[PDB]
Design a protein around this ligand. Structure first.
Ligand SMILES: [Mg+2]
Ligand SMILES: [Mg+2]
Ligand SMILES: [Mg+2]
Ligand SMILES: [Mg+2]
Ligand SMILES: [Mg+2]
Ligand SMILES: [Mg+2]
Ligand SMILES: [Mg+2]
Ligand SMILES: [Mg+2]
Ligand SMILES: [Mg+2]
Ligand SMILES: [Mg+2]
Ligand SMILES: [Mg+2]
Ligand SMILES: [Mg+2]
Ligand SMILES: [Mg+2]
Ligand SMILES: [Mg+2]
Ligand SMILES: [Mg+2]
Ligand SMILES: [Mg+2]
Ligand SMILES: [Mg+2]
Ligand SMILES: [Mg+2]
Ligand SMILES: [Mg+2]
Ligand SMILES: [Mg+2]
Ligand SMILES: [Mg+2]
Ligand SMILES: [Mg+2]
Ligand SMILES: [Mg+2]
Ligand SMILES: [Mg+2]
Ligand SMILES: [Mg+2]
Lengths: 56, 114, 121, 209, 120
RNA sequence: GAUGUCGGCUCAUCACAUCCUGGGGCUGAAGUAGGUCCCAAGGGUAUGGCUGUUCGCCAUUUAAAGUGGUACGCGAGCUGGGUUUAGAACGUCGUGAGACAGUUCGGUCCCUAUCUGCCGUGGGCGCUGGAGAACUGAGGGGGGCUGCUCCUAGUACGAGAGGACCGGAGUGGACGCAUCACUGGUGUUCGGGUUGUCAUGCCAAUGGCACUGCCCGGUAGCUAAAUGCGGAAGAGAUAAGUGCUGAAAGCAUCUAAGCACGAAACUUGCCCCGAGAUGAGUUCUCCCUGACCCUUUAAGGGUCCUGAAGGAACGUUGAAGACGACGACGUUGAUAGGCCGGGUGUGUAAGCGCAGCGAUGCGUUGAGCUAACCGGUACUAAUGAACCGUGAGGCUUAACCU
RNA sequence: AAUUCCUUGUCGGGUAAGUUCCGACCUGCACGAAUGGCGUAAUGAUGGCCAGGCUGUCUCCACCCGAGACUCAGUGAAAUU
RNA sequence: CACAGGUGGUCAGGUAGAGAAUACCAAGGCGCUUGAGAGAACUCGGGUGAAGGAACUAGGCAAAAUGGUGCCGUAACUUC
RNA sequence: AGGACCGAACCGACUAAUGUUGAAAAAUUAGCGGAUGACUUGUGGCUGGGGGUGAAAGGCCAAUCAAACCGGGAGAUAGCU
């Protein structure tokens, strides 16, 4: 099966309407450090919910 | 669950004696008949077995008049009434479906004997 | 029990294997067991007997493998299907004796003649 | 009459002194305090909104507890109407129990549904499987010929063909009642009602004879 | 539909999910920390904890059986002896997860399985 | 500058010149059963043997095995048996190449779907302040089958044989829906037996590989052959038909005036969807009542401060699920995992002891092990934040009002 | 009959029922003796028919294990128009 | 094409086995240059199936089955 | 002994599925036929186009064959599109 007609550039976009991306609804900062880390998991240096796991 | 189980054991009977997949037993159920109510006996050989609380089965091989019969009693059923044990045997298996196609000699199930 | 299906004979005359060429009891009626009427076709018969091979009469299923459960739920199942031949036009058994145990399902006041024979249930 | 909102959690025997085993779904109706009455001059009909459970008083939104507190507050799973007529109930949670279906033998039971989802014919429409063998290329079990041809042109609606199978009211009607044993919010039917345990059911007298 | 079916099949025979988990569990009992896949962890979870639980008790009995799983007759020592009595009081949370996810090649989300008592 | 043939399969949809079932007229209609005509399209409407068949004949069923339209419905859905490629042979015709509206054996069936169309399922925005809900129900769809037995009543009818009506009761066939409690199936995540071989130093005990190696049995879940329930009653207006009273037309007449019955059709009753019903509906509840400027000022545009109800997000997850969606839970916690105890299933572990020359047996032991289960338990993981949404809601008229 | 149009000839056998099959009849549309006639043990991935075993071929599908399908990240076509 | 195809010769360990079959291994060489999840219809390759057992179909197509050594025993017909 | 039997290598190609913008311009998988012989294979050689070769299908003669490929007559001719 093929297209009997060439889809207009217009229609093409309509399809890419829901193709857009999303943001991040803002992330999170740690308490033990201003660690600008992702919500619910390890900071840039072993930290997370306070404390600090994984050396270095 | 919690409501059940208790609502189940609420019907369960305690007249049920010891069992085994090799035992013989002789279940005695009702019959009703025409205007009667006689108790029909059914001495056989347990092959499979219940073990599900109120919900329980027997599965007993007998081999009546020439042909073999198999009955899956429902342990906790008013129709079950009495249920002997007769001869207990050693099997070393949970289900004796293998004891199916056998017949004399090839079926001979060595008694338990404790 | 459905077309074909070779069942033994629980009565005498025209012994051994007999094929069910139809399941009477309505359109599309799939299978039949317990104690239903079945169109049989003697495929063995005995040297003498009363019904010879090739005969196409009717019969009643006396024993099935799918057993027969009753109220309580407990089921009764025999090993090997069996039926009993009987006059075509006006029911009732053709043989005199009935071998093997039967079931209380035939206690119907229309098959009495059979349950009244030695065996069991 | 009106009915009560229960919660599926049954399926168990109940042998009789006669020798019969009766199947049955154990519906649980723990009171149904009417959360609000609906008038025909104020609303437009004759109904009685009720509840049965009681949220953890945490997930209860103010707009929710606002409607409850407005009347006989006491939280609960949700709100359920019950169109009635020629007989009302005390607005505030008058509290109706399983003893309601006392001199009753009808019942309907309206759970959610199954939940197959996957769909696909042969199961959602009880279709027929094509030649398992004897050739047949990539067409063992499939729709096969959905329409007709040029004359028809399109494909008539309703054309059975796969699609989500599950989650949908689907009542039952009838179902002889076994025991209305109250003082434990217990009600037993004949057996086989929709839902899959812990489901919200709407048991009420069968509209049918 | 899997309705109410427990257990994760990752993506391979019921054989792989007996080694890529056995070599992992044993690999966990060693360093007490790992940066595996989130799922490949939440699963590994109910693989070691059971072993540790089984580790609570000694005896050749609950030993050889412990040797059955994890053919490492070495880490079995780490069990019963080391982390054996270590968690000889814990309720079962012998494991942490420490999420982080997102690997290089595959956008796959990694994790950090670790013995609850690893920090020193 | 290609619209794939016949039959089958699968899946249909309509017509009515109706096969069954429902309602009536006439009868060469005693009853039972028929014959024929009128009405009626709700639903239903056979398995095999022979053949490529369609059809047909035959066997045996059924309430019945309807007729026809749909590219003689259906190959970007299946087949490829018939039939038109190339091989080969027979009968036949031709000197022959070859040929046949004769036969015979053999003979490559492509396509990842853009558009309409369907079946499902989300994302926007709109419904005039914003929310969380519960309904109303315009409409739309689903379903609409029928056997036998008994009671009536061995009565009415009939010479007998035979044998009803109306009405009532029970149990089936086929079909649909739901559900795993039962009966079973599956159960490569549970237990066991065992062949070959490799390995863990060896004995013992184990694991790997050989279709899960082969195999026995099985929890949850899912299921049908298992189990429960439904096609109704009742109304409305009728079809054909039947009539009352009734003149035109002194009678007669169902019609012209004028009333009464009347079917599985039709409207509704039963089940489900449903306010995008833009004709966007109703009811209940919840939230926000701080300040300025520029003006092209009847509206705006912008500023600081504020961000509510709620929402979404993230995480633990589900009998929910393709992904979105929907449900539960997030330390004010059982939402998952682990853990504890039980259950279940397997079937009496390992080690030791003893007996036997040994295979092996017995004891410890009914053990050992035990997934999706049940009861319970914060050990682990479910962070405090932050995020979006605001700040009393246009005009005109009427009703009320100080 | 690898030859028969009429043709599913007729009869018999097999089946519950057999336009195929096997044994016959002869009315050979239109067999026939090295473009060989009729037989023939053995052989055949050869044509037809029958049966026992076997079974998901089917009644009527159910579950289960894998590779795709679906989601994410990287690469990135096609016919057609 | 860093293509599941084609390509002649030589060497020939252990256990089991008739064996250059086959299975597990040694020496030796490899995991095939997208992966991570999920656990839908449907397609592909498989495993298990209640009762029936060729009713399938143009046709038993495909499946399922049978399968080893020793011994016993084995029909018509026959070119023996 | 044998164009003998069963069966790997080896030669072949009867069946089905899958592939059909393939892994592949004929394969993969499960079966299948021959397997001391008219066997099978390496290397080199000889037959050349109206000619060769052919256990005979119009088959093969470099993915081409009822007359190969390359170049030329050549802008063949084309009442046709
Ligand atoms: Mg193909
Ligand atoms: Mg049109
Ligand atoms: Mg008409
Ligand atoms: Mg027919
Ligand atoms: Mg036949
Ligand atoms: Mg056509
Ligand atoms: Mg095709
Ligand atoms: Mg053909
Ligand atoms: Mg393996
Ligand atoms: Mg002949
Ligand atoms: Mg000739
Ligand atoms: Mg991508
Ligand atoms: Mg490569
Ligand atoms: Mg079966
Ligand atoms: Mg057939
Ligand atoms: Mg057929
Ligand atoms: Mg075959
Ligand atoms: Mg096979
Ligand atoms: Mg040879
Ligand atoms: Mg091959
Ligand atoms: Mg050979
Ligand atoms: Mg050469
Ligand atoms: Mg060539
Ligand atoms: Mg010239
Ligand atoms: Mg030119």
């Amino acid at each position: 099966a093929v297209q009997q007609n060439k889809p207009t550039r217009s229609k093409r976009g309509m399809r890419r309407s829901h193709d857009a991306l999303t943001a991040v609804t803002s992330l999170s900062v740690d308490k033990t450090s201003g660690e600008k880390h992702l919500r619910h998991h390890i900071t840039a240096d072993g930290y997370y919910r306070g404390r600090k796991v994984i050396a270095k | 669950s919690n409501i059940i189980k208790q609502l189940e054991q609420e019907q369960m009977k305690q007249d049920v004696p010891s069992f085994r997949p090799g035992d013989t037993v002789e279940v005695k159920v009702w019959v009703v008949e025409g205007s009667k109510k006689r108790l029909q006996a059914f001495e056989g050989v347990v092959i499979a077995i219940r073990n599900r609380g109120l919900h329980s089965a027997f599965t007993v091989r007998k081999i009546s008049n020439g042909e073999g019969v198999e009955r899956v009693f429902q342990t906790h059923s008013p129709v079950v009434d009495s249920i002997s044990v007769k001869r207990r045997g050693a099997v070393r298996k949970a289900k004796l479906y293998y004891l199916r196609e056998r017949t004399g000699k090839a079926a001979r199930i060595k008694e338990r004997l404790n | 029990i459905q077309e074909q299906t070779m069942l033994n004979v629980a009565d005498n005359s025209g012994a051994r294997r007999v094929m069910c060429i139809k399941v009477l009891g309505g359109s599309h009626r799939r299978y039949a067991g317990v104690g239903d009427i079945i169109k049989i076709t003697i495929k063995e018969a005995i040297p003498r007997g009363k019904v010879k091979k090739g005969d196409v009469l009717k019969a009643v299923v006396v024993r099935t493998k799918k057993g027969v459960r009753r109220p309580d739920g407990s089921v009764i199942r025999f090993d090997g299907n069996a039926c009993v031949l009987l006059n075509n036009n006006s029911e009732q058994p053709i043989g005199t004796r009935i071998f093997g145990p039967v079931t209380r399902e035939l206690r119907s006041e229309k098959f009495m003649k059979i349950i009244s024979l030695a065996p069991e249930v | 009459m009106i009915g009560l909102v229960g919660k599926k959690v049954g399926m168990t025997r109940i042998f009789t002194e006669d020798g019969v085993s009766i199947p049955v779904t154990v519906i649980e109706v723990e009171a149904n305090r009417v959360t609000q009455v609906k008038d025909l001059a104020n609303d437009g009909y004759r109904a009685i909104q009720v509840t049965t459970g009681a949220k953890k008083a945490n997930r209860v939104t103010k707009p929710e507890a606002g409607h409850f507190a407005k009347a006989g507050v006491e939280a609960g799973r949700g709100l359920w109407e019950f169109r009635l007529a020629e007989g009302e109930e005390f607005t505030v949670g008058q509290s109706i129990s399983v003893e309601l279906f006392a001199d009753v033998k009808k019942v309907d039971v309206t759970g959610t549904s199954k939940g197959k989802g996957f769909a696909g014919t042969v199961k959602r429409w009880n279709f027929r499987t094509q030649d398992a063998t004897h050739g047949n290329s990539l067409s063992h079990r499939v729709p096969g010929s959905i329409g007709q041809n040029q004359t028809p042109g399109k494909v008539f609606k309703g054309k059975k063909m796969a699609g989500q199978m599950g989650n949908e009211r689907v009542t039952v009607q009838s179902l002889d009642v076994v025991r209305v044993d109250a003082e434990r919010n217990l009600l037993l039917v004949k057996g086989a009602v929709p839902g899959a345990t812990g489901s919200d059911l709407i048991v009420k007298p069968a509209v049918k004879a | 539909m899997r309705h109410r079916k427990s257990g994760r099949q990752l993506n391979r025979n019921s054989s792989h999910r007996q080694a890529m988990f056995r070599n992992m569990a044993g690999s966990l009992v060693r360093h007490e920390i790992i940066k595996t896949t989130l799922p490949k962890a939440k699963e590994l979870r109910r693989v070691v904890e059971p072993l540790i639980t089984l580790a609570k008790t000694d005896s050749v009995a609950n030993r050889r059986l412990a040797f059955a799983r994890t053919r490492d007759n070495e880490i079995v020592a780490k069990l019963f002896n080391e982390l054996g009595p270590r968690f000889a009081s814990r309720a079962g949370g012998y494991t942490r997860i420490l999420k982080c996810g997102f690997r290089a090649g595959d956008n796959a989300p990694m994790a950090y399985i670790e013995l609850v008592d690893r920090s020193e």
